[PDB]
Symmetry: none
Subunit: 141 residues, 4 copies
């Protein structure tokens, strides 16, 4: 079960994208958002976003969400369970800043429309999508 | 927009897996399930499953669900919206049966624990993510 | 069945597209990722759009033995493709294989003087299936 | 360029499979082999295999090979360049042993047909396969 967490945090860190849905917001649609973490494992999970993001208005002090995640080869599927709330902490913005994130804000770190969400993940259901090689066959083409 | 649907139905048909969550069931966890459709496009979307699946008990005449889907290289993400209900129709079982599905049932098509769900999808929000290859860099390895 | 195998291969190839293609004595034998295209749903030849200044071109002469390395996205299939590779910048073929994606690569469009087309005449491939089965789901404290 | 190596070693470590071809052996066919490394980065790269593997007979003191690698998900392609030779070192077998490797040998670590190859990689050409997320569009179906 330590293996599982490791695989998850690795997949998550490199593949990043989490589809994130909130009931009663936008018809419950799960939006693809790019996850970021400090370090190689362990949350919270951070998403850069925009102040006008509808999700923001409705999060209040924090809300229960289910994040849907798959690795980019579908060898791992995780249903992430945790609390989601805005936490646009300037210190955190500095830590998580990079040229990729930077491309999104006209105003840079100081963009008044910049927002940051944190997902405090307490558990995830994780499915491994494990494979077996077979004798390779020589075939005329 | 015709194109987006085509891309979607294609990814869905070959990649298959959809993560499917129901609130008030199992803490809202989205379970990976394998989608099947007749023909190359158009729903409904069918999932083989088990009678004891908790989701079943709670579907009643049908329920609103959001299916989360990505293609196998993440060049497409779809949030699928529709109604989900059991419809273990013997005719449908025959149409959708194959060796892969067969591996799951001790009893075959006749397994008393076999169940089939249909998702009647009315819309999906679809995000394209297409990759373009950067230029190759030589790199030394220690 | 060995007909199954070819079908899976041609399908993976058609949708996944990328083939890593190496030539000895060219560029240190490095296998470059190139995007394969075929007419129809199966069967070669396999076509790669490329550039006239591509070093590979200089060295192909009337045609050359190459090994193309291919995996499907998700890696459920690996194919080692064996065939002859040669330039065949046939205007008719360019028209048949043209699309907005290919178009994005040429400043001059179909008329770009630096446009080149390669054909790989594949006679056989060694093919390995790697199919994946989903394990029971585990819940982890996090 | 440090980023690139990191991504490579990570993809390699978790995805493992490298297609490995030798001229004048088996028509130059690149066989899918599962790479293993000690630690999270840095070679050599190890492949468990069999003594009767034709590749073995022809490696002598070592040979130049090109290993073709992609990540599942095709966000990274690496052409790996290095020297390949058998080095069935008992200490190394112990270090790299696991239930997955174990499933391949009737005789376990002691299987007389067990062989281990090491690829001493000096460089790789690496291509990143970079994506652009477009704006989501609702569609009818």
């Amino acid at each position: 079960t330590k293996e599982l967490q490791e695989k998850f945090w690795k997949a998550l860190k490199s593949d990043r994208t989490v589809m994130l849905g909130l009931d009663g917001v936008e018809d419950g649609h799960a939006r693809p958002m790019t996850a970021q973490i400090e370090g190689d494992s362990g949350g919270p999970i951070w998403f850069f976003t925009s102040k006008d993001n509808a999700l923001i208005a409705m999060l209040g002090q924090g809300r229960r969400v289910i994040g849907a995640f798959s690795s980019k080869g579908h060898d791992l599927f995780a249903s992430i369970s945790g609390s989601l709330r805005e936490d646009t902490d300037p210190a955190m913005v500095d830590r998580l800043w990079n040229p990729y994130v930077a491309a999104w804000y006209e105003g840079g770190k100081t963009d008044p429309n910049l927002a940051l969400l944190r997902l405090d993940a307490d558990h995830a259901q994780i499915w491994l999508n494990e494979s077996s090689l077979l004798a390779g066959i020589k075939v005329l083409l």
